[PDB]
Amino acid sequence: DTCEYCGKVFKNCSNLTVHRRSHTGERPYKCELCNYACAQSSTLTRHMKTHGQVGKDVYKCEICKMPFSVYSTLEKHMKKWHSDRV
């Protein structure tokens, strides 16, 4: 089948459905811990790795108690989302 916007045609209709999301902006797969959403379930699994993998220490946000695997990520979360509280 053919792409509406790009016009790029691929042998895979499943991949085209994902590609059309980039034009449409649809993000069906929503994270259960934050506002993040994406067009591919695999990419959401990758995102979920940043909320704390089992077996490693997990840092929670001081304000909203959101889990993060990496401390620098939690710092970026603070600046992006809790700047209004300073």
Add this chain to the structure above:
Amino acid sequence: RRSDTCEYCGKVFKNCSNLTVHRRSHTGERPYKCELCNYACAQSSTLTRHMKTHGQVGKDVYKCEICKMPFSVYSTLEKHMKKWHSD
């Protein structure tokens, strides 16, 4: 009473043969084993499909340098090399 219902989940089928393949997702049975790798599936035509990743009627075939496993897609061969041959 026609053996159209899954004993594990209760799904009903209009084709009893579909129940036979479906049930293997509950039992883990995978009778169709690929002869060119360790792949194994529960549906005959799925193994037929997977074998297309090993080669075509003509086209070109890339074989792993170490284990001589054939591939039709080079990127797949690269993933195989990293997965099995890190030495």
Add this chain to the structure above:
DNA sequence: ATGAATCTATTGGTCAAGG
């Protein structure tokens, strides 16, 4: 450094036409 976005090849489960 950490992670999202893009890309694509392969796979699981479904289903029913037709053999």
Add this chain to the structure above:
DNA sequence: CCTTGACCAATAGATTCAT
């Protein structure tokens, strides 16, 4: 009834940006 291949979502990994 069984075989078979199309269909769609899911998966896994690689590359390419963004911050």
